[PDB]
């Protein structure tokens, strides 16, 4: 299962994930690929902010679903 992580800034990435994966796992993969510490990341999906501890399945995030990433100063 793939998910896009997009930014309003305009850059994007693709992530391979598991429906069972938690938001903190996702933010980890983002750190792995992008170098962004998960403490600075904010993920949203369909107008809802995503909390660590919840899985990608608690939101019906599926194949080619697009999350938006916001960065913290």
């Amino acid at each position: 299962m793939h998910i896009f992580v997009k930014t309003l800034r305009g850059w994007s990435i693709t992530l391979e994930v598991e429906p069972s994966d938690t938001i903190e796992n996702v933010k980890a993969k983002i750190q792995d690929k992008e170098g962004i510490p998960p403490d600075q990341q904010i993920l949203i999906f369909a107008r809802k902010k995503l909390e660590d501890g919840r899985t990608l399945s608690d939101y019906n995030i599926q194949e080619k679903s697009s999350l938006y990433l916001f960065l913290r100063l």
Binding site: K6, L8, R9, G10, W11, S12, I42, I44, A46, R47, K48, K49, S66, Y68, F70, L71, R72, L73
Partner: protein, 374 residues
């Protein structure tokens, strides 16, 4: 149930403009069935634009009625808008919705092709021939130079829209967001930067540039990577049919003008509609289908455009209705109070129908929403 917008009046005046500016004699279009795009491109572009207002004379080489002028408009429309050729692309999955491809620059002469497509579409309208374009209502709003709105945005890029809404509703300063008035765009691997404001690396604050930011992102998103293509299209069009002539119409009327009327089958529609927080036994749903029953096809089409973003039905009826996320049947969801007006999300083919208190109230509210909106 009827509602006149003055559409017959508008159509009659637009047709009279075209016919009263018809030119004598003909243009000859000589093509091969297997080289239709290229043959038509070359011949139409070598002609003066006003020649296209002469009567049209099409020849399929090696064969033998306009008539097959109709066949030409049909076959050529489906070919020039085929994503195979990198000029247009499907919007979300497919939806029978087509939009300009930002990566059309892959062909160094793409602007010559968009000029030709503009001419060709204008020719169809001028000659009263219908086309199966998949142009979105926001694309038509652009042809009419009408303001593009944030709801228009939801129809074009749902997640982008959702992200702007989240910004709008939440305190970005408490979250500590770092965002600037600039946006990058990657096309065919090339990144170009665009300041939304002079010197745009310049921070978004809860207020009130976040509202200003949101509106700048909205305006920027509609023409993202397609400004030159869109200008070339509009210029070619305007050469044949002045865009000013279209000002009789709104974007939904324009869509009907171009693509034609369809007969909407009530039974097929009702059988393929799904509900959220309603059932077929909700009195608002019973009223809804009674409404659809009493209403003529022109009001049905305008209701279809409201909820799905087009007057055109897929081959295979409502059972094959597509949404910008894949197959999505017509959906009616209960929201809000009897006070509210109806709303829609065209990307999901979803009508938000408030729990109205009477049949008459539902009829009046719904007619207002589909005839006086978007």
């Amino acid at each position: 149930i009827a509602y006149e917008r003055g559409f017959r009046w508008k159509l009659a005046h637009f047709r009279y403009l075209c016919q009263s500016n018809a030119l004598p004699s003909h243009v000859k279009i000589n093509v091969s069935r297997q080289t239709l795009f290229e043959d038509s491109f070359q011949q139409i572009m070598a002609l003066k634009p006003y020649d296209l207002r002469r009567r049209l004379y099409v020849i399929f080489r090696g064969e033998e009625y306009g008539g097959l002028a109709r066949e030409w408009f049909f076959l050529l429309s489906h070919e020039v808008l085929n994503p195979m050729y990198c000029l247009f692309e499907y919007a979300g999955k497919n939806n029978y919705c087509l939009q300009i491809n930002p990566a059309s620059t892959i062909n160094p002469d793409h602007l010559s092709y968009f000029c030709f497509i503009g001419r060709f579409i204008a020719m169809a309208l001028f000659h009263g021939k219908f086309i199966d374009t998949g142009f979105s209502l926001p694309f038509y709003k652009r042809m009419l130079s009408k303001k593009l709105t944030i709801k228009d945005l939801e129809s074009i890029d749902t997640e982008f829209y959702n992200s702007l809404i989240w910004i709008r509703d939440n305190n970005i300063e408490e979250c500590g967001l770092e965002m600037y008035f600039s946006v990058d765009m990657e096309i065919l691997g090339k990144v170009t930067s665009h300041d939304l404001k002079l010197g745009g690396s310049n921070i978004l604050v809860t207020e009130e540039n976040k509202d200003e930011y949101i509106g700048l992102m909205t305006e920027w998103r509609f023409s993202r990577g397609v400004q030159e293509q869109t200008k070339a299209f509009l210029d070619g069009f305007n050469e044949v049919v002045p865009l000013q002539w279209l000002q009789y119409f709104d974007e939904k009327e324009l869509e009907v003008m171009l693509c034609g009327m369809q007969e909407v089958d009530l039974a097929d529609w009702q059988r393929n509609t799904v509900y959220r927080h309603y059932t077929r036994n909700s009195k608002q749903i019973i009223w809804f289908w009674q409404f659809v029953k009493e209403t003529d096809n022109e009001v049905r089409m305008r209701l279809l455009q409201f909820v799905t973003g087009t007057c055109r039905l897929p081959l295979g009826g409502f059972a094959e209705l597509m949404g910008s996320n894949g197959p999505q049947k017509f959906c009616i969801e209960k929201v809000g109070k009897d006070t509210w007006l109806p709303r829609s999300h065209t990307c999901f083919n979803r009508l938000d129908l408030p729990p109205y208190k009477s049949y008459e109230q539902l009829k009046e509210k719904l007619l207002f929403a589909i005839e006086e909106t978007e």
